Design a protein around this ligand. Sequence first.
Ligand code: NA
Ligand code: NA
Ligand code: NA
Ligand code: NA
Length: 402
Amino acid sequence: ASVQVTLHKLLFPDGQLPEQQLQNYRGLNDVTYQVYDVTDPFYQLRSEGKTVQEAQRQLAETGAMNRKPIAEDKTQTINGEDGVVSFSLASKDSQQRDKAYLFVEAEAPEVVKEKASNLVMILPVQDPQGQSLTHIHLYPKNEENAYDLPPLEKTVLDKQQGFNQGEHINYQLTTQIPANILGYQEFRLSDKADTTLTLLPESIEVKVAGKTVTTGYTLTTQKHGFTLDFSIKDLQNFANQTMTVSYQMRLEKTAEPDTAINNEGQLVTDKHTLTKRAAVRTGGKSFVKVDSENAKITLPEAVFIVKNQAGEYLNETANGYRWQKEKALAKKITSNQAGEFSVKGLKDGQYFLEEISAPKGYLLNQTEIPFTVEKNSYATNGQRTAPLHVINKKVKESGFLP
Ligand code: NA
Ligand code: NA
Ligand code: NA
Ligand code: NA
């Protein structure tokens, strides 16, 4: 003749166990309980004059010492209830005496700060009306460690020189999967960027500890951002580990130099929304074509191409700029009616103008003209930075000889 004893292990947040004083607990798996038969010491104490309660409290303290447990099992999910473990136990002994059992929480997950007290059960267990129960339900209560809300970092890789229009910019969102992640009901990472950044959808990789995360999320992408929705149950595998989301965005040709181009990362849980900003920039340089004798004389129709230190030529593609070796594919910049022209959408560096076509009445000089792109070489908060003078030498004493 047996009793079934079911333990429903509960976990409460730090400082929130009911003794410490709604819907703020969860079942906890992987808690090992041992059961000890304490029938003998129970009846000894009773014969010695101790009350039932007195003996039970003593047994709770000393009953496991020098006694091998008669059963051992772990809590697990049973019928969609987490933290369950059940034991089938004899009601009576050889002498026909109602038995007594001690339940000890032997080992428990890292999240537990304080284990449940030992439970001593003296059979028969009765309802308030004195009817013996065959199925007995206990609710041992664990206290959880204090844990922070998960952090967020948005990071742009190698961003100190800015970026060329067209360049594939590498980003990372980093967070820490908390130890108490099973306590959460929602975990979402998202990126949203200015319209001057276009997301490369196939670039999105989720890694934990350097290994790719295969499943456990949904992904939704737009032109300028995305959303990762994570299964809470599947995050448990990554508890206490760093998760890194890698992706790329292309900087578009609409990207103005010396403007903050913004993105915003977001971590959304049921508890809080955390937001992190990052920014990238591109660079430019303004020029004015002038006469070598009178700088107030500005010259239209001067035509230039742009070279880098390797001698490669700036080419314009559909989606940005590229450094290539064919001079025929070089983008052509032409001085306008006020002699003005600019180069926009370059990362910091040393570049050169090469004149390919001179204004009417001026000498062609093909000598490379050095210029520097750096923060604020184009503008400062909307205000344009003064143009570099490019001097042209007039055809010398023209109209004197045929
Ligand atoms: Na937490
Ligand atoms: Na990347
Ligand atoms: Na997309
Ligand atoms: Na400028």
